[PDB]
Paper text:
Although all these antifolates are used clinically, their use is often associated with dose-limiting toxicities arising from the lack of tumor selectivity, as well as emergence of drug resistance. To better understand the molecular effects of modifications to 6-substituted thieno[2,3-d]pyrimidine analogs on GARFTase inhibition, we determined the structures of select analogs (4, 5, 9, and 10) with a range of inhibitor potencies in complex with GARFTase and β-GAR substrate. The thieno[2,3-d]pyrimidine scaffold of all analogs makes polar contacts with the backbone atoms of Leu899, Glu948, and Asp951 in GARFTase.
Compound 5, a fluorinated analog of the noninhibitor 4, shows modest inhibition with a Ki = 13.7 μM, implying that intramolecular conformational stabilization occurs with the pyridine N···H–N that positions 5 to bind to GARFTase. Compound 5 harbors the same polar contacts between GARFTase and its l-glutamate as 9 and 10, and the pyridine N of 5 now forms the intramolecular contacts with the amide NH, as indicated in the crystal structure. Taken together, our comparative analysis of the crystal structures of the fluorinated compounds 9 and 5 versus related des-fluorinated compounds 4 and 10 provides molecular details in the solid state, which account for the dramatic increase in potency in one case where an intramolecular fluoro-hydrogen contact may be important and another in which an intramolecular pyridine N-hydrogen contact with the amide NH is necessary. Both intramolecular bonds in 9 and 5 restrict the conformation and are clearly important for GARFTase inhibition. The presence of a fluoro-amide hydrogen contact and a pyridine-amide NH contact was corroborated by NMR and was also seen in the crystal structure of GARFTase in complex with compounds 9 and 5, respectively. For compounds 5, 8, 10, and 11, adenosine was completely protective, establishing de novo purine biosynthesis as the targeted pathway. Neither compounds 5 and 1 nor MTX inhibited ATIC up to 200 μM.
Numbering used by the authors: 808 to 1007
Amino acid sequence: ARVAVLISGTGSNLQALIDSTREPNSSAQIDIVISNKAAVAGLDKAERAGIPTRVINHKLYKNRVEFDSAIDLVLEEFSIDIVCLAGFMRILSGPFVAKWNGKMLNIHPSLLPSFKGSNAHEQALETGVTVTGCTVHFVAEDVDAGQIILQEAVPVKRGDTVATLSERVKLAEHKIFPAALQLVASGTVQLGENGKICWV
Ligand SMILES: Nc1nc(=O)c2cc(CCCCc3cnc(C(=O)N[C@@H](CCC(=O)O)C(=O)O)c(F)c3)sc2[nH]1
Ligand SMILES: NCC(=O)N[C@@H]1O[C@H](COP(=O)([O-])[O-])[C@@H](O)[C@H]1O
């Protein structure tokens, strides 16, 4: 399975995905890394691993649909089968999401459906949970509401901050995201016609 990884930032999840897909038994190959922001650290991790990169500045486009179309063009150029959103922060448009339905995965740093949106850790800390986690799900049109593939709980320790909590949660992200990609890449898991997770 040919994979594109979209990033907006540091690329720790990207790096975990690079490491896992180099394993001999990997069912996925990362063929392109797309960033919507220039000179982010994930672009370096990609070049060090010998993976093509492309910056598609969202700031240059009239609206989401145009910008998504620019991404889609690169996805076709590279005959991509699966899209991983790994720290990619731009909400995608309906048509793009529908096109990639069942082929696009996103990592989210909470146990969905808790704490959807961009600042999950802040919410988690403000709410006072003692267990949080991360969620790999298919991208549906409703942000952070697509079908759930894997999750891993992570404890909240007293005194935690966004810095310390997100650091612990990212250790789980680097486990379940490579695992979720391998499940989809190998056809073990797919989005069902009824729209629920299907473990073939
Ligand atoms: N249809 C669809 N379904 C999905 O499940 C899904 C998941 C995605 C992964 C991205 C993370 C989820 C998320 C993204 N973005 C924002 C946000 O407010 N983003 C600002 C830009 C802020 C910035 O640039 O840092 C904006 O895009 O306007 C947010 F609150 C939460 S994208 C997507 N699209
Ligand atoms: N709303 C989406 C979101 O919060 N994404 C989060 O951004 C980080 C990216 O880190 P990375 O750039 O080191 O992979 C990850 O912690 C991921 O869960």
